[PDB]
Amino acid sequence: AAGATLKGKLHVPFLLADGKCTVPLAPEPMITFGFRSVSLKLHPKNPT
Amino acid sequence: VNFNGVKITAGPLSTAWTPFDRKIVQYAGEIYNYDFPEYGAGQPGAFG
């Protein structure tokens, strides 16, 4: 319209709020040793 | 062999060659060559 359109204010629901979410945990890696060296065999399920 | 008079001692073969290694795997009608672990050394993640 022409004159002055701003009549009121709404409130937006479902805002981004905090909490806790259950994220996965990788399989236990295999750790071989060596002089000044650590060798790791890694076997994931999903990308990690 | 002994069919008629003659006997034929075919043998040996002049090489001990095999395409088959000591350790072999059979699956899906196909014979792979693979160094599978023995009965007890089955590491997690791989064959065994």
Report resolution (Å) to 1 decimal.
Answer: 3.5
Experimental method: cryo-EM
Beta bridge partners of A30: A41
Element at A44 (helix H, strand E): none
- Give the distance from residue B25's alpha carbon to the nearest chain A alpha carbon, in angstroms: 23
- How far apart (Å, rounded) are the C-alpha atoms in residues B48 and B43? 6
- Give the distance from residue B45's alpha carbon to the nearest chain A alpha carbon, in angstroms: 6
* Sequence-ordered strand ranges (E) for B1-48: 2-4, 6-7, 24-27, 30-33
Residues A14/A18/A20/A23 CA torsion (nearest 10 deg): 80
- The answer to whether B45 faces chain A, any CB pair under 8 Å, is yes
